[PDB]
A paper describes a structure:
[name] is a restriction factor that blocks infection of certain immune cells by HIV-1. [name] is a GTP/[name]-activated deoxynucleotide triphosphohydrolase. Human [name] is a 626 amino acid protein comprising an N-terminal nuclear localisation signal, two major structural domains; a sterile alpha motif (SAM) and an HD domain, together with CtD, a C-terminal region required for interaction with Vpx isolated from SIV that infects sooty mangabey (SIVsmm). The HD domain contains the active site of the protein and in combination with N- and C-terminal sequences also incorporates the two allosteric nucleotide-binding sites, AL1 and AL2, that regulate the enzyme through combined binding of G-based (AL1) and deoxynucleoside (AL2) triphosphates.
To ascertain if a differential preference for G-based nucleotides in the allosteric site exists, two further structures were determined, one with [name] included in the crystallisation of an active site mutant [name](115–583, [name]) and the other with GTP and the nucleotide analogue inhibitor 2′,3′-didehydro-2′,3′-dideoxythymidine (d4T) included in the crystallisation of a [name](115–626) construct. The [name](115–583, [name]) structure has the same asymmetric conformation observed in the [name](115–583)-ddGTP structure and has [name] bound at the AL1 allosteric site. Nucleotides are absent from the active site likely as a result of the introduction of the [name] substrate binding mutation. The electron density that nucleotides were built into is presented in S6 Fig. The G base in all three structures makes the same hydrogen bonds with D137, Q142 and R145 of one monomer along with a stacking interaction with R451' of the opposing monomer. The basic side chains of K116 and R451' also make equivalent electrostatic interactions with the triphosphate of the bound nucleotide illustrating that the binding mode for each of the guanine nucleotides is broadly conserved.
Author numbering:
A (entry chain D), D (entry chain B): 115 to 276, 285 to 505, 547 to 582
B (entry chain C): 115 to 276, 284 to 483, 490 to 507, 514 to 530, 539 to 542, 547 to 582
C (entry chain A): 115 to 276, 284 to 505, 515 to 530, 547 to 582
Write the structure that this text describes.
C-alpha cells in the first residue's frame, strides 16, 4: 500500500493494483505533459503535469465511492467497483498529447481535418495498450476483478457507452457520475484540478470538496439513480462555481496564454512533415499521425517542443524560429475578439478554413497593404464560444489592416461586432 | 514594467531591464530544469523548475535592498544598486545543469574528476554569454548602469570575489554582498525562496515568515564591518527558519529513494556521455560532460537530455536507455546501508570515481561495477546572526537541530544483496567510518 | 451538540451540558460586559464582550485536554475529566463586573478598601448561583458527572485551592490544573484566546500559533510532578507568544488615554454609588459597590450601568452624569506624569483612596500660582521562559512591575503646570523614580 | 489630525473638523447600537457597532474622492468637496435606532404604520440636530466650508434630493455616487460593511476595495458624469458580488437570527406603552415616538433592551418575559417560508395586517386547535422578498395548525407553495 505525499490532498494511499498500473511507461508518460500547456508561459507557478493530477482524481474517485458505500449499504457497492472507479479516475487523462488540450483541441483539427479525435478516445486506447503491454489482467483477477466485464466498465466511465452501458447494471447507474459527469459537470476530475490549478496559480479556492463528499448521498430522481448533495451546502456549490469562473476568467481564457498555445501549434504544423516518432514494429510516425499507433503515442509528449527548438536540421528552421519568437517574447499580435450569435457553432473541422475566410473578406475602406491568409491565426475557444483573431505581422500598418479584415469578417458571418 | 503572478510571493513587479534579461534563450532555459531533480519521482507535487525560483530570488533581493534603503537613507543605496542586486538575484542559478544539483554534485565529478566546476561558476559564464549575445549593455546604460564595474558587482554577488576583496563595490557598501548569496550564515534571499517554494510543492509546513524578517531588517556595525542585522524580536522566527530547513532536509532532500533515483539518472548520463552530441559555438560538437566548457552548447543542455536518451533508437544508447526504463518500471537500485565519516575530514568530489572500487576490494563475488556509492552533503549559524534592539538602533547585540555516505547495489537477488551488505560493513571498518546500524 | 461559528477558532462544537449552562441568565450576562472596558474609547474595533471570550476558552481547554488524552492514554483521562475542564474554561470569567478589570482593579478598592474581592472569586460564587438557579446538577449526572466532586474540581481550576492542596482531583491528574488557569507561568488557554482575540479586534499582529502548540503538547515528568510540556521545536513559537503579549500590553492595555478613561468611568461610578439601587435576592436592595455581596443582584450588574447613569434625569445623579458626558465630548482628565516604585514597597489596593490626598499634600515649592485640592487629582496604579518545560521526542517522557500615573481634572495651563509640580514632588517624598 | 487604529482599514487619519463632529453625544450614540442587531445572538463575533462602521465609511469616502481629484484635476475637486464627502460618509448612519435595521425595517412599521420613517431621514434630522447643538457651523467656516451650501450637499448625499440636487452642480454629479449610490448600489458604505461583517463573522472576503480605488475613473456615460472602473477590474466586481451573496445567504438571512430580531421587536411593542424617554423641554416620549424629537432619540439606543430586561414594574412583565425567553433560548418556532409572485412587494404599511391575515385563513381539513392572530409572527425579508411565518406556541398540535393556516394563507394570496 504505497502512500504518496500530495500538496493538495495530503497523503494518498494507493492500492497495489493501482501502483502496478502507475509503474508503466504508458502512465509515467504523464510526467511530461504540462497541465496548463502554454499557460506556464504566463503563470510560472503552473509547472504541474497530468501525472500528479491523475493520481488526485483517482484518489478522490476512491474517496467518493467508499463514502457513498458506507452511508448507503443498500447500494451494494463492492470491493471490485471501488477499484474500477479508481482505475477510471487514474487513467481518464491517459490519452492527452503534448500541451494537453492544445493538441486535440487545435493541432489535430488543423493538421488532419478528416479525422475525428478526442483525448478520451485516446485514453481508452492507451489504457488498452497499457494492460496488454504490462500483463495487468492477471493482476486484476488476483484482486478480484473480472477483466472482460470491468475493463468495459473502466472504459465506459472515460469515454461513455461504446440502457446503453454494458459494464454495470442500471442499479449502479450512479457510479458513472463519479469520475466523468457529462450533464451537470460536477465530477472528481474538476474538483481536483480546480484546487490544483488554484494552488499553483495563486488563485483563491472557495470550494471545500471533502465536506461535499461526506454530505454526498445517492437519491432517486425520475426513477434513475444519481448523486445528490444535502441542501445547506448549496452555499458550497456556489463557491465551486465561483472558483470555476475565476480560473476561466483569470487563467484559462488569458489573452497571452492562448496566443502562445497557437504559436506552439503553428510551430508543430511547420515541423510535422519533418519530425519522426518511432512506433510499433519500427514504423515511423508523424506528430499528427502518432495518434494512430499507441507505441509511438507513448513517446509523444511536451518534449517534442524542445526537440524542435534544439534541432539543427535546416528543414526545421521555420518551426524553430516560431519557438524562438516565444523565447524572445516577440509574440503574435492581438487583433480582436468576437462571438457566434445566435445558435451557430463553429465546428472543429472548419478550423483550417477560417484564416482564408478572414483574409478573403473585402474590408474597404481598403488600405496600403493586403494580407494573405498565412498572416492570420483564428483561435476558437470553447467552454459559449469565443473567436479571437491574431496577426503574425507586427507592422502597425499590417496590424491596422488585419483589424479591418476582421471587423468585416464578423459582419459577413453574422457575428457580434468587436467591441 | 511587467507584473507576474506567483503562487508564493503574489504579484511580482519587474523593471524593463529585468524583462530584457529574462526574455533571452539563456534565461528561459531555466524553464526546462527541474528544481528537485529526482525528487519529482518521490514527491509528485515537486514539479517546479529553476525559472520561477530565479524570479523569486530576484524579487526578494529587490524587496530587501529597497526596504533597507527607505528606512536608512544614510547608507546611500542608489537605484543603480537595487537593479544590480535584483539582476544578481535573478541570474544566480543560470549555471545549473540537467536536474540541478545532480549535475554539478555527482555527474560532473564522476565524469571529469579532473575539473574545477560549480554551477555558480557556470552562472557567471552564462551571465556573460547572455548579456553579450543579447546586446544588454546598451540597455544597462540606458537605465543608468555602468557595465564595466556593475557587471563585476553582479558576478561578485553570485560567485564571490574573483583585504577588501571586491572590485564591484567599496567596503562601505559591503552589506549588499550579503543579500543574494551569503555564505557565513547561509541566511540569504536564495534560501528563503526555495524553503517557501519547496514546502508549497512538497506539502511541508513552512513556519518561517520571510516577509516579517525583511520588514524588521536593518544595517548595523559589527566588528568594524557593516552587516545586515535582525530585530531581536525576530529570534523566534529564526528558530522557525532553521527547523523548516531541518524538516526539508530530513524529509525530502535526504530521501533514500529520491537519491537512489538521482544516482540512476546519473548512471544513465554516463552511459550516454560518449554517444550524445550537443551542438556548440562555431559548429563544434560537445558531450554532456563537456558542454560546460562552451556556453553556446550549454544553453542547449537541460532536463530534455533525459527524454532524448529515453526515446532513442540508436543501439549505442541501449545501455543508458535500459536504466531509465528501469526507473519507469520502478525497478530501482537496492539500498544496502548508510554511514558517516565522523571524527575525520569528509570526502571530496575528486575521489568520487574511486569509491565503488574501494568497496569491491574489502559465497558470491561482486565487482565494483555493481556498486553505487552516494555522498550526501548538506553544504559541500545563529551565533553568526547579528541582532539589534530598538533603543540604540545601530548596535549589534539547547533547542535547535553533515556528510552521509550511502551505498546502493544494482543486483537485486537476495544473496548478492547480502554479500553487498558485508562488502559495505567492511569498507566502513577499514576507512574508520561509523558502523552501519 | 450545537456548533458555533467563531472568527478566531472557526467552528466550535459544544456538548449539550455546556449549552445548558450557556443558556442561562448568569451566563448570557457576559454579553453585556466589554473585555477591554474603556479601551473601546481608544480602539473602535474592540467592541467584543466576555461572552465570546468564554466560549473560546472553553473550546481551547477542550482541544488541549482532548489532544493530550488521545496521544497518551496512560494518563487515564476520562470523558468526565474533559467536560469538567471545558466547564471551567467556560465559567472562569463569570465573575467579571462592569468593564472587566476596571471593576475589581480600581472601583471596588476605591469604594470598599475594607473588602477583599477578585473576579475569580466571583466567578465561583456566580457559578454556584448558576447551576442552582437553573437545575444543572441533574443534567450533570445525566452526563456522567459526580456533582460534589466535579464542581469542586471546576471551582479549583478557576480560583485555585480553597502537600497537594486540591480535593477535586488526585495528583496523578495534576496536569489538568494547568490548562485553564496556570498559576506561575501564566501560559494557559485563557491567555491564548484573549491574545488572539484582542489582536484580532485591535489590529495587532498575533504571531503565536496556538494550534501548533496544542498539537505538540505532552505531559512529561518534571521534578516529581506531571506538567504540561512542549516539543523542543516550539521554542520559536513561545518567543513569539511572549512578544505578542508584550506588544498587547505596551500598545493597548497600558494605553495612556485608555486608562485615563477607565479612571473617569470609575469616578462616575463612585459619584453614583450612593443613589443607584440594584434589586437583589428577596427584594433586598443593593448598591453598585455592594451588589457583589449577592449574586442575584450581580447578574443584573453589567456595562449597562454606564448608560443608566448617562441617560438619567435624577438630580442626585447630576455629578456622575457630567463626568460621563465629559467622555462623550472628549474633555478628558489630563495626563500629568508617570513613575515607578523601583526598589520601594509597592502600593497596595488598601491604600489607593489615600493617594490623591498625598499628592495634593505635597508641597512642591517653588510655590506656584494656584493651589490644587486632592479632588483635583487622579492617581492610577497599573500592575503587570524559565517556567516552561520542553521535551525531545527521542526522550518523550521527561524534561530537558507597578506603574503609577497621575492625572489632573483641571485642564488650564496654569492648573496643569501646578499639577506637574505636586507630582514631581510626590515622587521625591515617596522615593519613586524621577518623572521623565 | 487624529489618527485612529482600525481592524479593517488600519490607520485612519481624521481631519480636525471631522474630530469636531465625532466628539458629540449625537455621534457617540452610535457606540451603543449593534451593527447586526439580533445577529449577535447567533454569531458571537458580531459584537461591532454602528460607530466603527461610520468612521470606516467616512474614511473610505475620503480615500475615493481624494483619488479621483488627483488622477483627474479637470474635475475641479476642492478640499471643501473632500470634507463634505467625508462628513456624509461619517453621518450617513446617524439615524439608526436600536438594533439598526430592526428599528426602521420592522418595529416602527408595526408600532406606527401610518408613518413616513426611514433611518436615512433620521440621519439627516440627527445631523442637523448635531451641528446646531454643538456649534459646528463656526468650525465649518474656519476650515473653508459654506454652511448653507455644504450642509445641503451633505444631506443630499445621505437622503437624496429633499437635475434634482440643490447642493452641487451637475458637472460634479459623480460625488453623489460615493457614499450612498442607489443606481447600482455600489458605494463605499457597502465596501466597509461587507469587509467588516466578514471580519467579525469569520466569512471570507474576496473583494479588494483598495485595488478598486486606484483604478476608479470619472468618465462620461450617456449625457452624465459617473464613476467607472478599469476593464481589468471586472473580476474584482464579481468578487464583491460573491462576497455579498455569501453574507446574505450565510448571515443576514439566517433563520434563527431573524427569528430573534422579531422576538426583540415583540418585546418592544409590549413595552412601548410604558417606557418613557425624556426629550427636549422635558417633554416625554415613547420608544416609537422618540423619532419625533432628536433630543429624545439621541438617548434611544440598544440600552432599551437591557432596560426592559432588568425592570421590575409589572406593566413591563409581558415584555420582560419575551426577553427572558431569548436568554433561556426558548424561541418562536419556525413554521415556513414563501415568496410573492408578480413584481409585487409587501409594503411596510401592511406588515401589521399580516398576522391577522394568516389567522383568518380557512385552512382545512379541520384541526384540533383554533389559532388567534397573536399566535403568528410574519417576517418580511428584503434584499427579492422572502416571507417567513413563526408561531409563538410551541406544542406540536399548535405547530401543526400553524403550518396549515400558513400554507392556506399562501394559496388564497397566490404566493409560491412552501416546500
Ligand atoms: N516577458 C516575459 N513575461 C512573462 C514571462 N513569464 C511569465 N510572464 C508573464 C508576464 C506578463 O504578465 C504575462 C505576459 O506578458 P507579455 O509580455 O507577453 O504581454 P504584455 O501585454 O503584458 O506586455 P506588452 O505590452 O505586450 O509588452 O505573462 C516571461 O518569461 N517573460
Ligand atoms: N512506484 C511509484 N512510487 C512513487 C511514485 N511517485 C511517488 N512515489 C513515492 C511513493 C512512496 O512514498 C515512495 C516509494 O516508492 P517506491 O517504488 O520506491 O517504494 P518502496 O521502495 O518504498 O517500497 P517497495 O520497494 O515497493 O517495497 O515514492 C511513482 O510514480 N511510482
Ligand atoms: N477624540 C476621539 N478620539 C478617539 C475616539 N475614538 C477612538 N479614538 C482614538 C483616537 C486617539 O488615538 C485616541 C484618543 O485621543 P484623544 O483625542 O482622546 O486625546 P489625545 O491625547 O490623543 O489628543 P489631545 O489630548 O486632544 O491633543 O483614541 C473618539 O471617539 N474620539
Ligand atoms: N443556545 C445558544 N446557541 C447559540 C448561542 N450563540 C450562538 N449560537 C449558535 C448556535 C446555533 O448555531 C445558532 C442557533 O442555535 P439555536 O439553538 O438557537 O437554534 P437551532 O434550531 O439551530 O437548534 P435546535 O433546533 O434548537 O437544536 O446560534 C447562544 O448563546 N446560545
Ligand atoms: Fe482530468
Ligand atoms: Fe537558488
Ligand atoms: Fe479570561
Ligand atoms: Fe452604513
Amino acid at each position: 500500500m504505497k502512500v504518496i505525499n500530495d500538496p493538495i490532498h495530503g497523503h494518498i494511499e494507493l492500492h497495489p493494483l493501482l501502483v502496478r498500473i502507475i509503474d508503466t511507461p504508458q502512465f509515467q508518460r504523464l510526467r511530461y505533459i504540462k497541465q496548463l500547456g502554454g499557460g506556464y508561459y504566463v503563470f510560472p507557478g503552473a509547472s504541474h503535469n497530468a501525472f500528479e493530477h491523475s493520481l488526485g482524481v483517482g484518489y478522490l474517485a476512491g474517496c467518493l465511492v467508499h463514502a457513498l458505500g458506507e452511508k448507503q449499504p443498500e447500494l451494494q457497492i463492492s470491493e471490485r467497483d471501488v477499484l474500477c472507479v479508481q482505475i477510471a479516475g487514474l487513467c481518464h487523462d491517459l490519452g492527452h498529447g503534448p500541451f494537453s488540450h492544445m493538441f486535440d483541441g487545435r493541432f489535430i483539427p488543423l493538421a488532419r481535418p478528416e479525422v475525428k479525435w478526442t483525448h478520451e478516445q485516446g485514453s481508452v486506447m492507451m489504457f488498452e495498450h497499457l494492460i496488454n503491454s504490462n500483463g495487468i489482467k492477471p493482476v486484476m483477477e488476483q484482486y478480484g476483478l473480472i477483466p472482460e466485464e470491468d475493463i468495459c466498465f473502466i472504459k465506459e466511465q472515460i469515454v461513455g457507452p461504446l440502457w446503453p452501458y454494458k459494464g454495470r447494471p442500471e442499479n449502479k447507474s450512479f457510479l458513472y457520475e463519479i469520475v466523468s459527469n457529462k450533464r451537470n459537470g460536477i465530477d472528481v476530475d474538476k474538483w481536483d484540478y480546480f484546487a490544483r490549478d488554484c494552488h499553483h496559480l495563486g488563485i483563491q479556492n472557495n470550494f471545500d470538496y471533502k465536506r461535499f463528499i461526506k454530505f454526498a448521498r445517492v437519491c432517486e430522481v425520475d426513477n434513475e439513480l444519481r448523486i445528490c448533495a444535502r441542501d445547506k451546502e448549496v452555499g458550497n456549490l456556489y463557491d465551486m462555481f465561483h472558483t470555476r469562473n475565476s480560473l476561466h476568467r483569470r487563467a484559462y481564457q488569458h489573452k497571452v496564454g492562448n496566443i502562445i498555445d497557437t504559436m506552439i501549434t503553428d510551430a508543430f504544423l511547420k515541423a510535422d512533415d519533418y519530425i519522426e516518432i518511432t512506433g510499433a514494429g519500427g514504423k515511423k510516425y508523424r506528430i499528427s499521425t502518432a495518434i494512430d499507433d499507441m507505441e509511438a503515442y507513448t513517446k509523444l509528449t511536451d518534449n517534442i517542443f524542445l526537440e524542435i527548438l534544439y534541432s539543427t536540421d535546416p528543414k526545421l528552421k521555420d518551426a524553430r524560429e516560431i519557438l524562438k519568437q516565444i523565447e524572445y517574447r516577440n509574440l503574435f499580435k492581438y487583433v480582436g475578439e468576437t462571438q457566434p450569435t445566435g445558435q451557430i457553432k463553429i465546428k472543429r473541422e472548419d478550423y483550417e478554413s477560417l484564416p482564408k475566410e478572414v483574409a478573403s473578406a473585402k474590408p474597404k475602406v481598403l488600405l496600403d497593404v493586403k494580407l494573405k491568409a498565412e498572416d492570420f491565426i483564428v483561435d476558437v475557444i470553447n467552454m459559449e464560444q469565443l473567436i479571437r483573431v491574431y496577426c503574425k505581422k507586427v507592422d502597425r500598418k499590417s496590424l491596422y489592416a488585419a483589424r479591418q479584415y476582421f471587423v468585416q469578417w464578423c459582419a459577413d458571418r453574422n457575428f457580434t461586432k468587436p467591441q
